[PDB]
Amino acid sequence: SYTTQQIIEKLRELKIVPVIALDNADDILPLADTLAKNGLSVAEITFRSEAAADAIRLLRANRPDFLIAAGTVLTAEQVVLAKSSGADFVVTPGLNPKIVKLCQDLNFPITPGVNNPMAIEIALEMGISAVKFFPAEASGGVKMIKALLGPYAQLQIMPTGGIGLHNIRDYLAIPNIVACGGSWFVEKKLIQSNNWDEIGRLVREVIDIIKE
Amino acid sequence: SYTTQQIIEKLRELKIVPVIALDNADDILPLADTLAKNGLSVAEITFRSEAAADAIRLLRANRPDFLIAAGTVLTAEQVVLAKSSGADFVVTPGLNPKIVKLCQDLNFPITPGVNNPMAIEIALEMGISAVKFFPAEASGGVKMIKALLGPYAQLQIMPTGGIGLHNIRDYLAIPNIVACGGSWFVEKKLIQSNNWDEIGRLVREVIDIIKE
Amino acid sequence: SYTTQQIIEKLRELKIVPVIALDNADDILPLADTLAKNGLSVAEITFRSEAAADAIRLLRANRPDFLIAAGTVLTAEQVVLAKSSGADFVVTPGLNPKIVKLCQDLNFPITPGVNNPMAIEIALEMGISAVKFFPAEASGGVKMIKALLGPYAQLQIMPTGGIGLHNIRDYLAIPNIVACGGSWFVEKKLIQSNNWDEIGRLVREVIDIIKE
Questions:
Q1: Which residues bind pyruvate per the record (chains A, B, C)?
Q2: Which residues, 6+ apart, have CB-to-CB distance to C133 below 8 Å?
């Protein structure tokens, strides 16, 4: 049971987080074996798919050490089920204060999404310094981030949205940016076709470009 | 009186809503005749004009089945006056929780405006799933809307701001987009000169473009 | 002591506000000197720098008629210290309702930052009509401002963020724009190397481009 800051530091070593949507929860086992084999033992499983909770539970049992996030959490029921399924922390696209307060009252780490100054100031008012920046590219990309970093100099940021091979290095060049999220290397059609080699290829490719 | 969901379904058949600002309230009659004749029996009368409430009243008396929205509603006094004037629903540029609650406590349909994830979360927390997206082009346009529809896949959106003949079809191609608001076919200068023929043509032009 | 409205009219005459980040408090005297000789008796001292309070106090004593703003104020302690040090008003990058209400409760003028309709409507609900627009360029610049001035036509705006010589005239051509904030003419390097002449040249350069 990692604290929020230990999770943040573990993400800082990883730098890229796969955002996984599944139609079939059993696909999480060969998928996670492929991610771990290629050096990424972390996954944000989206509640946009109904199979999310069962996948978190199966993965926790098979790989007790895997870093697991429940993503796109919008309701109190999802928080509760994310915690009992075994997730390590929660990720949300926006900041709904009842949802943030609930994770805090359950000692359940949460990285909420912000994209402007009002949202950042609500987060800082609730004791939160590590946030998701979403949607990254449509909200102004690297230019908006650098601008928000003038007055909010100690924010720890985790961007998601419109991030690919062509711009991941631009985001990772910024010291306050902890890690980026994306799904091009774990695309839904590749998971559905069980093409584990293509997935492992794309994983190695993003890992290489980052360490360039 | 129509419920909120019935109004959303009517707007979905119309697809384009005229946003009207006028100096002389009496012009709403020839203007609505011109809209009705050419296939568009709907109007959003903005409270940016002082002639707004008299125009809504006059129109409700002359054409009892016309769909009428009161736009730019920022105060409780305007909410109350829009209701007694006879408007079917309220439209707002942003989301003030006190104005939304009053409309819901008065059984008066309201489509408030948002442009980022924080504002969408508050709308969903207050039981609202049909929102105005404003200002649409300056907030990032179609690309910002598609990015928002990843996590909030059930929102029903009505874009306003920067919409014209050249981009109305790019917005209407997205399924969750109900209808768009626009003022170029009801330009103030044409209303000031009572140029009802040019208004009729512009309305027919957008209607045909959309059907294409 | 000036009221909030009196400060706004005072900024409407200056048109440009130096945003200063000092490492050494004593540098404020030679800086205030250069600025005051070249036509701008006004500064926004950031609490981003540890010696901000001493700088304001020193500057107030030496030139009691200078217009001083405490900027980047995020906590109640900062509000209380900015007032006892002698600042005329507070500038914030976003809008934290607890901070604004405390300034109003101490009769201390504040211009809070906004960049989207929801933040504007919270301001208006709090009786505020003069706001900082930040970060200006990254939020859509001149195009965002003009789209927001449609429904919020009485707003009084002060943009900051990406404002340079190449675009200050585009913002000042909008009547609701009171004055812009910038730091290129009082840049870090120039202060530390005590380049009072290079700074004085840039101040005249921007005042001239504005009045052209």
A1: 48, 72, 132
A2: C113, C114, C115, C139, C145, C157, C158, C159, C160, C161
Least Cα distance to C73 among C104, C99, C109, C39 occurs for: C99
A159 has a chain B CB within 8 A of its CB: no
Tell me the technique behind this structure.
X-ray
Residue C133 and residue C160 in contact, taking contact as beta carbons nearer than 8 Å: yes
Q: Are B83 and B77 in contact (CB under 8 A)?
A: no
Domain of B179?
Answer: 1-212
* Alpha-carbon distance values, B10 to B14, B160, B186, B193, B211 (Å): 6, 17, 21, 31, 17
B83 contacts B53 by C-beta, under 8 angstroms: no
- For residues B139 and C117, the answer to whether their CB atoms sit within 8 Å is no
Q: Give all chains having 3 or more CB-to-CB distances under 8 Å with chain B.
A: A, C
Structure tokens belonging to residue B73: 């509603």
* Size of chain B in residues: 212
For residue A114, give the amino acid letter.
V
Convert C153-175 to b/e letters by CB count within 10 Å (16 or more is b): eebbbbbbbbbeeebbeebbeee
Residue C79 is part of a domain; what is its CATH number?
3.20.20.70
How many angstroms away from the CA of A152 is the closest CA of chain C? 9
Distance CA B96, CA C125 (A): 8
Instruction: Suggest the residue from B46, B98, B116, B133 to mutate for an interface test with chain C (most C CBs closer than 10 A).
Output: B116
Distances (CA, A) of C43 to A36, B22, B135, C180, C202: 55, 44, 33, 12, 15
Residues 6 or more apart whose Cβ sits within 8 Å of residue B121: A74, A94, A95, A96
- The minimum CA-CA distance between B115 and chain A, rounded to whole Å, is 10
> What are the start-end ranges of the H helices in A38-112?
52-62, 76-85, 97-105
Judge whether B13 counts as a catalytic residue: no
As a whole number of angstroms, the distance between CA A12 and CA A177 comes to 9
Q: What is the DSSP letter of B177?
A: B
Partners of A133 in beta bridges = A114, A159
Give all strands of the β-sheet with B110-111 in edge-to-edge order: B110-111, B89-91, B67-71, B42-46, B16-20, B180-182
Between CA C117 and CA A52 the distance in angstroms is 35
Alpha carbon of residue B129 to chain centroid: 16
Single-letter amino acid, residue C208: D
Q: What angle do CA A173, A178, A184 make, to 5 degrees?
A: 85
Domain count, chain C: 1
> Measured between CA atoms, how close is B134 to chain C, in angstroms?
8
Is the distance from CB of C136 to CB of C161 less than 8 angstroms?
A: yes
Residue B95 contacts residue B112 (beta carbons within 8 Å)? yes
A132 annotated active-site: yes
Q: Which residue from B120, B147, B153 is facing A94, i.e. has the nearest CB?
A: B120
Q: Which one of A13, A15, A37, A44 is the catalytic residue?
A: A44
Q: Which chain B positions have a beta carbon within 8 Å of A115's beta carbon?
A: 116-118
Residue type, A108: F
> Which residues does B80 contact at the CB level (< 8 Å), separation at least 6?
none
Q: Are C70 and C49 in contact (CB under 8 A)?
A: no
